Amino acid sequence: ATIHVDGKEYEVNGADNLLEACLSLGLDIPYFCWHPALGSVGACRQCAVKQYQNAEDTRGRLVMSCMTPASDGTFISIDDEEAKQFRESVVEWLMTNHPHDCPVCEEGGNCHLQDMTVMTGHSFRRYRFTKRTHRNQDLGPFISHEMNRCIACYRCVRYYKDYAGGTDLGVYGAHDNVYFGRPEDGTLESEFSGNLVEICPTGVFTDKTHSERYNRKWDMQFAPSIC
Amino acid sequence: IIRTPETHPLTWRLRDDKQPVWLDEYRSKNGYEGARKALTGLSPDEIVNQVKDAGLKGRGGAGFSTGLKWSLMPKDESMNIRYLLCNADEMEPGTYKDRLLMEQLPHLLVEGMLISAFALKAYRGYIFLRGEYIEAAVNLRRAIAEATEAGLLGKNIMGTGFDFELFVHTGAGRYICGEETALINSLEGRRANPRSKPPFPATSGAWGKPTCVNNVETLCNVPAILANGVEWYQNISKSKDAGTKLMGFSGRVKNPGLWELPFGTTAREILEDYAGGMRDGLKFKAWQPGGAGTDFLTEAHLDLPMEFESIGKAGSRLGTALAMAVDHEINMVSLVRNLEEFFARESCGWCTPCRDGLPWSVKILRALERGEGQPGDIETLEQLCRFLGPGKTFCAHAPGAVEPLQSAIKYFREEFEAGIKQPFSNTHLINGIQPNLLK
Amino acid sequence: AFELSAAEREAIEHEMHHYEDPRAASIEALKIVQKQRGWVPDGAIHAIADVLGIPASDVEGVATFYSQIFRQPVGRHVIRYCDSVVCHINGYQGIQAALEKKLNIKPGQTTFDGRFTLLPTCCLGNCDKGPNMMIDEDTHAHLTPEAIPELLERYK
Amino acid sequence: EMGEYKRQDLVYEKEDLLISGPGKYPEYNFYRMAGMAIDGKDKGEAENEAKPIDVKSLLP
Numbered sequence: 001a002t003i004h005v006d007g008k009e010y011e012v013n014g015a016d017n018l019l020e021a022c023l024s025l026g027l028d029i030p031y032f033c034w035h036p037a038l039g040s041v042g043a044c045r046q047c048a049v050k051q052y053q054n055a056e057d058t059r060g061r062l063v064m065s066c067m068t069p070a071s072d073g074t075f076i077s078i079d080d081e082e083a084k085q086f087r088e089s090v091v092e093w094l095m096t097n098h099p100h101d102c103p104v105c106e107e108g109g110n111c112h113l114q115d116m117t118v119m120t121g122h123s124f125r126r127y128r129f130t131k132r133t134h135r136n137q138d139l140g141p142f143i144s145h146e147m148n149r150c151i152a153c154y155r156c157v158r159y160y161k162d163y164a165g166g167t168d169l170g171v172y173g174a175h176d177n178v179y180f181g182r183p184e185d186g187t188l189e190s191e192f193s194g195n196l197v198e199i200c201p202t203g204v205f206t207d208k209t210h211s212e213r214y215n216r217k218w219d220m221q222f223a224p225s226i227c
Numbered sequence: 228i229i230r231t232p233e234t235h236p237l238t239w240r241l242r243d244d245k246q247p248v249w250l251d252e253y254r255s256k257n258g259y260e261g262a263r264k265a266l267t268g269l270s271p272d273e274i275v276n277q278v279k280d281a282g283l284k285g286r287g288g289a290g291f292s293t294g295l296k297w298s299l300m301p302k303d304e305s306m307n308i309r310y311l312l313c314n315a316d317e318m319e320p321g322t323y324k325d326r327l328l329m330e331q332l333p334h335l336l337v338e339g340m341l342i343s344a345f346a347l348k349a350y351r352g353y354i355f356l357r358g359e360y361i362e363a364a365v366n367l368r369r370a371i372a373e374a375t376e377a378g379l380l381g382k383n384i385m386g387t388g389f390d391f392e393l394f395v396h397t398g399a400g401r402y403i404c405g406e407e408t409a410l411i412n413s414l415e416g417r418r419a420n421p422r423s424k425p426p427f428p429a430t431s432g433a434w435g436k437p438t439c440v441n442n443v444e445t446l447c448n449v450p451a452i453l454a455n456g457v458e459w460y461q462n463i464s465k466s467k468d469a470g471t472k473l474m475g476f477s478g479r480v481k482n483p484g485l486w487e488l489p490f491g492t493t494a495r496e497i498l499e500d501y502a503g504g505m506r507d508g509l510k511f512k513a514w515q516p517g518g519a520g521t522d523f524l525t526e527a528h529l530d531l532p533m534e535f536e537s538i539g540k541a542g543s544r545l546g547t548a549l550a551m552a553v554d555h556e557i558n559m560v561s562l563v564r565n566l567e568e569f570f571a572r573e574s575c576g577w578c579t580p581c582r583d584g585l586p587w588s589v590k591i592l593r594a595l596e597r598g599e600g601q602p603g604d605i606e607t608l609e610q611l612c613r614f615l616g617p618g619k620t621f622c623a624h625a626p627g628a629v630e631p632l633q634s635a636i637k638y639f640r641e642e643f644e645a646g647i648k649q650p651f652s653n654t655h656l657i658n659g660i661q662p663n664l665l666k
Numbered sequence: 667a668f669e670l671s672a673a674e675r676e677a678i679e680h681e682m683h684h685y686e687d688p689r690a691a692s693i694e695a696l697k698i699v700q701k702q703r704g705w706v707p708d709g710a711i712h713a714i715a716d717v718l719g720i721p722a723s724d725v726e727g728v729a730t731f732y733s734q735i736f737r738q739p740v741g742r743h744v745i746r747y748c749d750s751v752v753c754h755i756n757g758y759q760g761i762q763a764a765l766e767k768k769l770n771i772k773p774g775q776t777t778f779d780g781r782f783t784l785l786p787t788c789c790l791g792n793c794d795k796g797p798n799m800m801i802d803e804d805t806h807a808h809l810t811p812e813a814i815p816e817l818l819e820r821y822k
Numbered sequence: 823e824m825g826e827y828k829r830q831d832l833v834y835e836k837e838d839l840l841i842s843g844p845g846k847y848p849e850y851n852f853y854r855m856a857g858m859a860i861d862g863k864d865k866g867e868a869e870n871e872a873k874p875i876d877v878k879s880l881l882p
């Protein structure tokens with residue numbers, strides 16, 4: 001398949017969507033709700049690009065790159081001004097209710113939301129109203145829960161239920177009061193619940209065992225090992 | 228009003244005492260004759276072609292062709308499990324037409340679902356009805372029992388070997404369930420988030436099976452088409468939209484109500500001749516043509532016909548064609564605040580722009596109503612209308628949410644600027660840190 | 667210590683008969699439990715989940731999604747006044763003020779004797795006869811602030 | 823005036839750094855801004871924070 005991104009021609013797989021094809025090419029599109037192992041659902045609307053009908057098109061239309069196939073002869077723009085504005089606006093909408101928590105949040109320095117906030121170039125707050133808050137749940141010895149930091153990207157429930165087959169996690173409530181967690185306090189019963197701390201792009205689900213002796217990612221010494 | 232069967236196919240069977248018409252009275256008034264003709268003399272493909280040739284459009288608010296929607300069902304004969312769903316949710320504010328249709332003429336809906344299910348080869352049908360319509364549920368269940376007793380529902384209908392079962396599914400009170408894919412999700416017992424298209428419900432809808440979702444009024448328009456012919460339905464009005472439509476006016480008018488009119492009737496004819504005009508001492512300020520999710524229009528727009536393309540070229544949507552009048556005593560900021568509170572609290576929460584941008588507009592409108600608006604608030608509202616349009620959100624709930632806000636800002640900007648009375652302040656002063664004084 | 671009654675369970679299986687997947691009876695099961703008990707308590711989620719063969723997280727997500735499925739206790743009579751746009755034009759705010767004066771509660775609260783629960787609700791599909799409100803199963807139209815104290819006394 | 827005799831004594835631990843007052847910024851408190859709950863500040867008590875609305879609430 002042949003796609004044209006910002007005037008540059010690329011050869012991609014036609015069975016891929018535009019987000020995974022462009023990320024495979026080294027291009028940077030911000031995204032939250034898509035994961036390579038979970039597929040695309042088009043929830044967060046962060047991955048917006050401008051698709052044109054053909055080469056001689058100037059208006060275009062904003063589409064979600066995760067929900068758009070990378071078919072042959074596709075024409076898209078990532079660095080289009082309207083697409084950049086919409087992606088920054090999506091970051092801004094996520095930031096209206098986000099708590100002032102980065103110094104005391106275990107995801108800081110390892111946070112996908114921080115990275116995409118910086119990537120969209122959004123650094124000025126004009127929202128002046130109140131922020132919604134949530135009570136937290138006890139999720140057992142491994143996973144710490146902080147629902148204030150949720151951006152409602154649905155990654156946790158999709159991984160836990162659709163991928164891992166777990167049954168005790170879900171989404172509850174409605175419009176901006178969507179709550180991700182268990183129906184009551186208790187330990188997460190899945191044997192693969194620990195992948196939530198990497199699946200969740202924010203600091204909602206955090207490694208509690210790490211949190212006891214917390215340090216930031218840049219301060220770690222890593223090695224490639226085998227479990 | 229003189230209601231003949233040829234000019235008022237949907238409302239001529241209505242009684243004077245507003246009582247429901249049961250099976251004997253319905254069948255005396257040429258009831259289940261279109262069903263008899265469809266099930267004993269026509270192929271399902273022939274019925275789909277006749278519905279498409281009649282030009283029947285969707286009455287749920289989108290105005291899409293019913294025959295074109297029915298033709299998207301697969302021709303694969305291996306798929307023999309098919310569903311017909313009747314969107315009796317009707318949760319759009321300003322809309323009260325399906326309540327009239329199902330409270331007093333339930334057998335019209337039953338016959339329409341029977342004909343459409345035979346056309347679509349749908350073995351099952353569900354009436355997705357809102358829970359607040361208790362009398363409609365009682366009447367629909369009684370009519371379904373009467374039709375099953377008479378052999379019009381169940382196994383071997385009219386001796387033709389066609390099996391069809393009709394159920395009533397009462398809702399649990401959310402506006403987003405009226406959206407067709409969210410309706411399908413709600414029927415499956417899930418949270419009523421909408422689904423992404425493609426694939427359409429005609430290919431994989433309810434429980435993965437081929438499914439067609441249609442409004443109550445569309446299904447009520449079907450039996451008149453199949454009982455009187457395509458050329459009768461095409462000759463009701465000389466407009467691009469064939470057939471009749473339940474139109475009305477609500478608000479502070481003298482006679483708020485609902486009347487069956489052909490497409491092309493102007494809004495001033497509905498407002499003055501049928502609704503009786505405004506009340507005494509009230510001056511007409513604005514109107515909404517088709518429910519809470521349609522753009523406001525001014526007094527100068529009252530002269531154009533109530534058609535899809537005529538209202539669409541005016542900057543609004545025909546919608547349900549149940550218009551609402553706004554007098555001069557209504558503050559537009561307060562009205563749009565009420566509308567946006569409804570829309571923000573009826574967000575399903577799936578996608579970011581609706582879920583996290585409608586409450587911001589609500590808070591801005593609350594500040595404007597209280598006189599605590601700040602500079603940049605109207606610009607924020609305009610950018611919210613720009614960025615919540617079609618394609619930017621996952622479903623069409625948020626474009627409908629931002630239509631009245633942008634129309635009221637366009638036509639009544641002086642009321643929104645009156646709410647801005649304090650300078651912009653997002654930061655408090657921190658002692659010891661000199662602020663960066665931006666210009 | 668919740669236990670589904672025989673009538674509740676039988677109604678749930680009869681609802682399960684009408685669908686090709688028993689998950690589709692979750693909303694009706696919640697409404698059956700709510701109609702019997704006034705609201706859906708905490709153990710009813712697990713009871714409905716084990717009857718239908720779906721996880722309790724699914725049942726709780728459905729119950730907390732839909733506004734008419736009550737997951738907190740309500741009074742013996744639930745007043746639901748329409749706060750939508752046409753009833754706003756027709757003057758629902760006077761009705762809300764009269765209800766607040768008579769019941770001495772805020773919306774979303776229950777009276778001290780547990781008799782009335784005041785709730786705003788979306789449009790009731792009765793906009794030509796507004797302002798409208800719903801008491802437990804009855805719709806009252808053409809409401810005036812003067813008729814609110816008289817009409818509220820019909821429900822004990 | 824931080825001159826020292828031994829270089830090891832130039833390693834200042836927490837007891838040598840923590841002072842008795844606010845220093846150059848007399849009023850700022852980060853924990854009045856953070857959404858994380860501590861003693862004396864529950865959820866919804868921080869600046870520009872609404873009270874939490876539980877998902878089982880009766881309001882739409």
Ligand SMILES: Cc1cc2nc3c(=O)[nH]c(=O)nc-3n(C[C@H](O)[C@H](O)[C@H](O)COP(=O)(O)O)c2cc1C
Pocket residue numbers: 284285286287288289290291293314315316317318319402403404405406407408440441442443445622623624
């Ligand atoms: C937010 C939203 C709410 C809707 N509510 C209803 C409704 O209550 N009743 C209805 O018939 N259509 C409603 N619709 C339109 C449906 O998506 C769909 O067009 C309709 O149910 C069936 O199409 P038809 O008009 O061709 O019959 C709604 C759409 C949206 C986006």
Ligand code: SF4
Pocket residue numbers: 098099100101102105106107108109111112113114149201202203204
């Ligand atoms: S989740 Fe990310 S953006 Fe939010 S407080 Fe934690 S580090 Fe900061």
Ligand code: SF4
Pocket residue numbers: 149150151152153154155156157180199200201202204205
């Ligand atoms: S808890 Fe995390 S993974 Fe789940 S929706 Fe919220 S931000 Fe996404």
Ligand code: SF4
Pocket residue numbers: 403420421573574575576577578579581582620621622623624625
């Ligand atoms: S626009 Fe988005 S959040 Fe709003 S109702 Fe539709 S899918 Fe749900």
Ligand code: FES
Pocket residue numbers: 019030031032033034041042043044045046047064065066067
């Ligand atoms: S990553 Fe595409 S909409 Fe979320």
Ligand code: FES
Pocket residue numbers: 320321322748749750751752753754788789790791792793796797798
């Ligand atoms: S606006 Fe109140 S009943 Fe419709």
